[PDB]
């Protein structure tokens, strides 16, 4: 008979001012006008302009939620530990900010870690905070403009940063990360998780659902090997999900 199923439906959502959308396709037509890098009008530009004045401090990268740091880092460490045949040579910290993840996790697990961050005062502070540590290159670029060499990384970290990518560029970037992995490499993707999206009109970003992410992974040609919610996460915050992708 008629029955609930345990598909490519439109994903609706809204922004933080309360404008609503029937689909993501409708939203990107609204949000991706003009020069994307215009600081006042541009999807990307507005986000970069927002970050220009964020303090280069842990409080700054954690949106004033400093106290979630320890649990976040322990969850990632336990998750990465569990990945079968994960390599331990080279890592890349994408949207690195001041190098928090590199400083507290990657430098303990990888022989060399590179950093990718488009905001100059964030990247500069990372250089200072990471002085005398197993760090390689400091790449001043956005994810969507970065060129990564093939067959290089055993881990590619994308945490609290893919919210700034358009879906088109999310798809492109994850496929580009895939070719940058070694055979024992994984993308480590850690992000806030909504089945509707929320455009944040303050920092020009969006939070997507698990189904939305997976739609994008499928389009990228990238597969989920492992996934898990961050345990012991404050109940009032968006859930934080980790994905290991190959």
Ligand X SMILES: Nc1ncnc2c1ncn2[C@@H]1O[C@H](C[Se]CC[C@H](N)C(=O)O)[C@@H](O)[C@H]1O
**Least distance to ligand X, CB of residue 127, Å:** 14
Helix (H) or strand (E) holding 164: none
Strands 240-245 and 13-15: unpaired
Assess 42 for contact with ligand X (CB under 6 A). no
Out of 75, 87, 97, 185, the only residue in the binding site for ligand X (CB under 6 A) is: 97
CB 5 within 8 Å of CB 188: no
Residue whose CB is less far from ligand X, 23 or 201: 201
Give 75 or 118: the residue with its C-beta nearer to ligand X.
Answer: 118
Residue 75 engages ligand X in binding (rule: CB under 6 A): no
* Cα separation, 112 vs 28, whole angstroms: 37
Q: What is the H or E stretch that residue 121 is in?
A: helix 120-129
Question: Cβ of residue 227: shortest distance to ligand X, in angstroms?
Answer: 18
Q: Distances from the Cα of 101 to the Cαs of 70, 96, 120, 235, in angstroms?
A: 11, 7, 18, 23
Angstrom distance (rounded) from CA 116 to CA 95: 6
Residues in contact with ligand X, counted by CB under 6 A, come to a total of 20
Q: Which uninterrupted H or E stretch holds 243?
A: strand 240-245
Please say whether the beta carbons of 114 and 137 come within 8 A: yes
In the complex, what is the shortest distance from the CB of residue 9 to ligand X, in angstroms, rounded to a whole number? 28
Ranges within 147-206 binding ligand X (CB under 6 A): 159-161, 164
Q: Does 119 bind ligand X (CB under 6 A)?
A: yes
Q: Which residues are part of a known binding site for S-adenosyl-L-methionine?
A: 95, 100, 159
Binding site for ligand X (CB under 6 A): 44, 47, 51, 61, 95-97, 100-101, 117-119, 122, 142-144, 159-161, 164
């Amino acid at each position: 008979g008629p029955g609930s199923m345990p598909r490519n439906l439109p994903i609706s959502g809204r922004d933080t001012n309360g404008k609503t959308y029937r689909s993501t396709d409708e939203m990107w037509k609204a949000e991706l006008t003009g020069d994307l890098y215009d600081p006042e009008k541009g999807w990307y530009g507005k986000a970069l302009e927002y970050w220009r004045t964020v303090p280069a401090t842990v409080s700054g990268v954690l949106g004033g939620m400093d106290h979630v740091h320890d649990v976040d880092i322990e969850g990632s460490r336990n998750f990465i530990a569990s990945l079968p045949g994960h390599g331990t040579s080279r890592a890349l910290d994408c949207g690195a900010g001041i190098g928090r993840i590199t400083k507290n996790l990657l430098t303990k697990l990888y022989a060399t870690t590179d950093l990718l961050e488009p905001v100059k005062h964030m990247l500069e502070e990372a250089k200072r905070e990471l002085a005398g540590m197993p760090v390689g290159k400091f790449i001043l670029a956005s994810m969507e403009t970065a060129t990564l060499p093939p067959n290089t990384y055993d881990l590619i970290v994308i945490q609290w940063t893919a919210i700034y990518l358009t879906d088109a560029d999310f798809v492109k970037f994850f496929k580009h990360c895939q070719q940058a992995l070694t055979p024992n490499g994984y993308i480590f993707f850690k992000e806030n998780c909504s089945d509707r999206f929320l455009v944040d009109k303050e920092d020009s970003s969006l939070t997507r659902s698990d189904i939305h992410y997976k739609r994008l992974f499928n389009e990228s040609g990238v597969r989920v090997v492992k996934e898990a919610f961050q345990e012991e996460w404050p109940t009032d915050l968006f859930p934080l999900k980790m994905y290991a992708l190959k």
